Amino acid sequence: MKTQVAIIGAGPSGLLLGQLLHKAGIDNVILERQTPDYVLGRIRAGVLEQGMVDLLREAGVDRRMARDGLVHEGVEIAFAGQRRRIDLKRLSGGKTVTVYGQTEVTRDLMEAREACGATTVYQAAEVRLHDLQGERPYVTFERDGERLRLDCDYIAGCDGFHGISRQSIPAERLKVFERVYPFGWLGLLADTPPVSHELIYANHPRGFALCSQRSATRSQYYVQVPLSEKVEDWSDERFWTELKARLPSEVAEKLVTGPSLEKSIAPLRSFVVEPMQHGRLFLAGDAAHIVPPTGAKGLNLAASDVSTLYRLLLKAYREGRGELLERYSAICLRRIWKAERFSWWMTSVLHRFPDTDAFSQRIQQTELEYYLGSEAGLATIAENYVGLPYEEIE
């Protein structure tokens, strides 16, 4: 097989890069290890930044999002029994975020790629990368009993945290930065109406809690739990009871509870690798970094990495400026680090950390009061929450 850009992974990153490349007239092939239904089987929510929304539109995959997506002009943080609203729209001059699940976004992308007939090979096993530092790199994989080869000009590793692309880079060239948090998120998806039309991030002595929604008909709640907790030890009633206990009475009072469609505990971790490329190989999304869920920036960083790579690829193919691709990592990393910083900040002010002393507890409460009670503080949250502007190339 022969293509211009080989894409490893058919998740959000890979699908979005490929559709953008498709519309731009740049040949591309996506190799996915799992099956279409397997990828679609991963149920993930989502809070899309303006930048990602624009990118999806530019990709020609926004019809369903515009119809089913939920535009939020604000977000709330609860602490000390009070609800403090951050007017994102007003504080940013008009920017908003759109609540539309990653599952739906992935589905939309798969339908668009399937419809245009772009190349995608599902169940592509034993993917291996070759000659990355040459001008003729290629990928090998095994599908339906045979060994196939894919020659290309560039390779985009969009294969997630456990993909093969990051592992195909000599460890001596990479620098890893990571952090694991002393707690996880117990989540519960329900078909009951949300307790609020905007998300509610809550800080409470017993621990963190979040009131959100996956769609107009699906509610999603979370409560902080220690790392050793067993989802099985948490019945729906125990979850509802703990959740209400971490929210202001006015909110817990009008909350509608119901049987859980799904429940699980997710860890919170940070991971960043530098650089994010090697020769003709470029990493994007989870293959290059992980952020804690607190900022809902994971899906958004995947989008921005793809935007940068896509824009740099155009420069290479349409202006013979392939040298600019060398700046891919530095550009992405500047945004990735700010996103890691903001997620870290949100996580630190909202969660209960073990063995924390009186001073730390007081400082945390003061962080919330200062930031939510100051226009400048409110602005720092707003601009970060809606997403910082994508850095223009060069």
Added chain:
Amino acid sequence: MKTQVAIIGAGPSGLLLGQLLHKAGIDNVILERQTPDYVLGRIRAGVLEQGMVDLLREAGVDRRMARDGLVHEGVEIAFAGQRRRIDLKRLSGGKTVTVYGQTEVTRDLMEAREACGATTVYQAAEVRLHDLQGERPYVTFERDGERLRLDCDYIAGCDGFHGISRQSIPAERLKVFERVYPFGWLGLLADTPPVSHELIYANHPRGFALCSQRSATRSQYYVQVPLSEKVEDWSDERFWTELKARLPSEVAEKLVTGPSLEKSIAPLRSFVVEPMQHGRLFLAGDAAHIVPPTGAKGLNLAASDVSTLYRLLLKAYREGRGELLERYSAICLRRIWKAERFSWWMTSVLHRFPDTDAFSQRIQQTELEYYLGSEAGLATIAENYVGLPYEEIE
């Protein structure tokens, strides 16, 4: 679930450690991601060091090996049209190597573990390690639709190069050492009798070639090929013709050719991580290192890592000397590096490297002539080939 030593991976490393632990009265559980047939489906040859043979016997799994194994007292290296034999037995004082495939060894171990009823969980998905730096580490995994937890005292990561154990160690604590060779090994397994009763490593201007055997009824041959070669471009007749061209006429003359039962191209690489442990987690085998095939030391290093870990575990459980486990990496690494050194040496004197000048070519030929024509040189090869003595703990 509760056990004393949790073992990730049911390949040679894991199975051997578990059987040794089983006989010693130390509780252990093996978690394997694939199915029994899947593991057994990997057809691998083998040249066992005296040390590994003894270990298998100590494990009580040597009956079939003693019956079907092929004891070799020597090995040959061909170059400049001549066959030079290295009398391993004589040069080492009585040590030999046993030709018995990893597939057979794995089968023997699985039958022994299955018979004694030791615990093994196949198809254990999403294996995850926890609290490694505590005194109560545990493993989580999903089997047959449910989330299970395994509490233990120690965890042995025997999950291969792409396992989860090495990835469960903070990258900031590890140092990676690696090298990739500019060529691969095109192999062909046949049911024809071997051209020789002892292996023949051959150096030839056209490239490296190896005459070996997987069993008394299966022959195994290899020829060096560039990294970009396609197994499909190599018909059996082309392989046989190239093979004979790299061997002395007397050998190529009496070689029996036949249809290939299997054919593939394998890359040659080296990989070592330091340290090989973190808290209560200890890596063994491919999860910690990779050596090129040239020395046939891969399976043997797996064996020695397991021997060291097993012996250190006994010290901990029977003498309250658990502090000695801290020396696990340093002991294994000293042997791993010498094995990497010897494999590197064998690879460098037997293969044709690209863009090599006249001086390099001459030096290589001289390396072979000096080492094969000197008793001291012959001894260095012999002691390394049969395997250096396992370092006693402390």
